[PDB]
Subunit: 396 residues, 4 copies
């Protein structure tokens, strides 16, 4: 927590040089009442690399280290103190190689807090404005010298380098000399490239913007276009469509057994233990068993979703499996579907007299709303029951 303020300070220092250096190459009337900030920022840039090594790499010559090395040394201040000429002063731009280090720091200190496409887009907008400043300083540099206030002759140059980079091109102020025209051609290429990069990053940002909502929309029309071929009845097709509308608006389209298959075994055990915690210590058949038994029955529960009105259990069937209610409600009717016995709710269960006995179903269990209930098969229970002899004697 005390290296992040140092990274913010280094970002401020390099942003300071990025605004100041091409502005003082044009005007040498600056730098003279402003040298102490150069002193402070140069000491900061030369002292960052020991703190770049220690407390940053443990917790000096590399192909991914030398921009910071070339940015560290005071290659500037010699130019502005000794009045080096125009084709030789330009090496004071070597401090601008520091921005690669700040890019590479910012693309990992907050890379998973925010979207990687959005971070790249914001970094590109920052570099484009910060480069439009330098291009405006260059255009202001190679103008014919005339008496003009230093605000207005910068304002026209910045207006020109925004008109050229965004490819609008009013053409109200144009090149005159050939040495202006070569500079104009090369920044037309750079402006078209930057605007292509911006359109590419926005196209990569809004393409993946709705993927969960588009994948579900494709999966819901694949089933519909298939069942229209099979000449299905429209009522059942409407029931399937309202099932998918439920499954989108509750758990966002994702199937249960394919989400918690991407967890390892102890975390999947922990999630299933947290889910079926207030349910499994209620049945009067698993009481008195060990903790070894509950962890093995709790990993073989299978989720199903019954719509409103679906017959879970018909009276008079064979019947094999027990059902644990998790979210919805359900009702229990008689064999003639008239006399309501009772109503069940979440945290309860039904069908427990099927794991131990070969009796046929004794009632009709109809769903009321969407249920989201789990089930346990008789074969799976007796398969993982064969290795526990004490409960194998308990159920007999």
């Amino acid at each position: 927590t005390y290296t992040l303020v140092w990274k913010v300070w280094i970002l401020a220092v390099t942003l300071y040089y990025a605004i100041r250096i091409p502005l003082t190459l044009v005007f040498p009337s600056l730098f003279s009442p402003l040298l102490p900030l150069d002193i402070l920022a140069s000491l900061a840039l030369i002292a960052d690399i020991p703190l770049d090594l220690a407390f940053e790499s443990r917790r000096l010559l590399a192909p991914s280290r030398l921009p910071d090395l070339l940015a560290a040394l005071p290659l500037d201040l010699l130019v502005f103190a000794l009045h080096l000429p125009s084709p030789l002063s330009l090496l004071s731009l070597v401090r601008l190689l520091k921005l690669i280090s700040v890019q590479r720091s910012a693309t990992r200190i907050l890379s998973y807090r925010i979207n990687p496409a959005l971070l790249r887009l914001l970094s590109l907008v920052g570099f484009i404005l910060l480069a439009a400043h330098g291009i405006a300083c260059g255009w202001m540099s190679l103008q014919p010298p005339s008496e003009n206030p230093a605000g207005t002759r910068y304002l026209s140059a910045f207006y020109w380098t925004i008109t050229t980079l965004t490819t609008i091109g009013y053409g109200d102020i144009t090149p005159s000399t050939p040495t202006q025209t070569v500079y104009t051609i090369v920044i037309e290429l750079l402006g078209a490239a930057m605007y292509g990069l911006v359109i590419g990053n926005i196209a990569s940002l809004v393409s993946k913007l709705d993927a969960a909502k588009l994948l579900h929309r494709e999966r819901v029309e694949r089933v519909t276009a298939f069942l229209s071929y099979k000449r299905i009845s429209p009522e059942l097709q409407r029931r399937i469509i309202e099932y998918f509308d439920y499954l989108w608006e509750t758990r966002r389209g994702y199937e249960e057994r394919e989400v918690l298959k991407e967890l390892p075994h102890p975390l999947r055990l922990a999630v299933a233990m947290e889910i079926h915690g207030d349910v499994i210590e209620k049945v009067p058949l698993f009481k008195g068993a060990g903790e070894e038994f509950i962890r093995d029955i709790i990993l073989h529960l299978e989720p199903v979703i019954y719509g409103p009105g679906e017959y879970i259990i018909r009276a008079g069937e064979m019947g094999s499996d027990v059902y644990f209610i998790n979210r919805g409600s359900v009702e229990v009717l008689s064999a003639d579907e008239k006399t309501r016995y009772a109503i069940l709710s979440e945290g309860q269960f039904f069908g427990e007299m099927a794991l131990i006995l070969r009796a046929p179903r004794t009632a009709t269990v109809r769903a009321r709303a969407f249920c989201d209930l789990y089930r346990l098969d008789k074969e799976t229970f007796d398969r993982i029951l064969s290795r526990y002899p004490e409960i194998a004697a308990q159920i007999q």
Copy 2:
């Protein structure tokens, strides 16, 4: 159904303010014979938030609620009644924060009726025109004052703010003062950003436009480029290609067992019951069985597709499985493939003397057109037959 007309009314009210307010900031000669519409619309905006709470959230200070709160209060009408000056009148634009609420309402009331990329594109076109109006009003505001009809001095400003935002840039009318030039730079940035967003949304809209037809086109060339490596004969390769052309033009490329695996168990049971309804109550071996038997044989049927001329059953083979015709036709030939016994059609079946007996095939069953027929294996039938003793005695 009576809240949707209220949402349409609120959209009309906020669109009314979005057109009117920057137009009356430039011309104070309006608002005076037009105050009653302000009264009606302000009452509507201040009375929407009780109906935003009740009958909308049940069926007041939140980070996703405060734009509607700041849009609700009559922060306007005080400016236009008391003649507040130019840098202070601009807070009458706070009503324009209402558009966030209308965006968030419209992106969920009709989000699955239409395409989410198309909805975002239409909303962006709406916001771009509705913002081009305000930018034209701003450009018309900071002009040098001269006698000019109020239609033409708006028409040139709207022509300018469309020439700048779409990045054409004729340059026939340009900035003159510095305070115009700063405004021109900032809306050049906004225009390049909006046009990047439009190109990005169109690129995300037409990329996923043919996905079902492109996925099948990739799957049909992956098989062809693989079988060209194996040095396959061109006749069988042409038969595979016409198989995939059939499977595209009938059920749109999708495989049967991977479409109805994305349904839950009761809906998959209901779909299979609707498909094999007029077929399974015709065989003279499953008649007299229970409803528990039919629901378990109907879930283990496996679809296959035979091309025109494919040998389904050769006379003299071992033979294990029964076949149920669903869509196409098929013919039955003798052992020498000469004397046609009969012809079968949809709704019928063949091979029923293989589930119960160890006799060899008694004829040759050749397909005629594309068949789309289901089959049932003998091992699967006898596996799910072992738990039903009465039909296990019936077949003996």
Copy 3:
């Protein structure tokens, strides 16, 4: 084959109207020595709809039929014969609704011959040029009338409507009147929209251009970045990389068992019969078996790929499975890897004394180049051998 020439004729007729009608709205000095082509093309458009019904739909009021219906009737020729004025002549553009029918015909008569993105891009380029003609005619229409040759006053208008639609915007010739300026604003919107559609279709065309070569490139770096974490030796890692280079440059990256799983059972049987045809009728253990036996052993062969130098069979091992060579070569060495017994090639086999006997390996079988050989497990052979009693007696 004789309806395609009629579709080409209808495309020529509607392209004729699309070039001619806005050009003759500006110049009424045409149409008079050119009426017979109108007669022929109008008869063609009114006679296409019986051939649109018969021999096209079997092999009259619908929401996808009425553009052809409105294009069929001679709503034109009345305007140009009776000299209808300017705001009323424009309904002669209703013939231009025929292009929807030609679009919908061309997007299905050759939809799978070529790429669906490329077809949409070419159709959009056609519509953009064909609309730039009409927009040029409109700009030429609402000019101030002056004596000027009819080639040059069209050439400047077409130059303007290409400068505006491609968003270059030289600005050398501009609007003058307000009624020109409104037309300029609306086609600036249309030009920005069309150029957004072109960039979107090119971005959707070149994104999926290399998918087979990019998917393999991702799969080859996922394995490398994983095995670099496990601290693997660089020699084996180089051998894995040259394996993937082989598997790209021969069968284009695709795995064998996931390509021919997307075929149905009879076509998969036919492909496996064509592959293992000149191989399986060579072993002296399957000779004398039936055709029922070969079709069941041929569906359980499993492909493996051995690199140059990989030990297939080590002398002295347990050994269970037989190997069928398909593409590469292999060599057979002794127990001390010195005395070469023989060399094998494609179409041959080795390890046949493992299906019938519990003897240990008798030699060392080293690969020489990449082999691409199939294998058959002993358990699978004896599992599908248990149901054939005669070969079960033959092998004993």
Copy 4:
């Protein structure tokens, strides 16, 4: 290694013609003191096609060969020696068809060293600059003839053809004649097309730029948005999130059993042998077994990842499986979780008294950091142990 220098020489020769030929069509005052380079380069182009056949195709009339054939012959030098006129000289551009051969050579000699989208983008930038030269030569050609230095009248033409292709369009220098205007329209179309191709390739380049980091970011929010529906506790949810942060920052998001399933059987055996090499020759139960035994136990090990504090083995449980530590550390506690017995590290193992015996767990094994350990089930060990009788007698 000595054909790559020849390909570089041919690329240099065709780049030489691509710069020189349209520049000498405008100025016939060249070519005369510069013919010997034409002689050398023409001999190179006519002698490349024998080395294109031999040592390139083995290691003459084809639809993918004839551009090189038409580029080979000296169709030039006759024009510049005999002073052919303007509409007939243009066939000297046929040498420019050589660039297709260089494109097709470069798109395969270094196609998997670098990114296929990046290669296409760099090739398009090369072709766009190399075509902007020729378009500038054409614009310079059809100018009104006036005395002007040959550097400046080229510099304005290149400035114009960069202003038009990047769609900026200052409009400072414009067409004058109609024959200039037709050329301007056709290169406006070409410039809009090229800039659409550049934006499309950048949009296809930066879309797939972070796929491994975006796929993991989607998989980590799918689990979180699902477990928020199940009303899970925030502490376990934080533990799941830090698990996924570990699994990203170590092995880049990929699951173990789905990476080395995309290898064939001998390479998967070799990778597992390299991983479990310094581990399996340490247990005092597998010592004295054969090499046939180790290769079969080493293919059935299953990876699991325990977080810091997860109970691997609880004292008093049933217990079945043995665990092999690979990367992390683990600690062994007593039944009351107080007295630390020992600490284990990588290369070691625990739980070996579970494969042979039906005793219950004798301690508590808690993880300390992230472990990355493999396990072997008792049922799998005894299943692959049943076919080896000597170790089946050794364990008793």
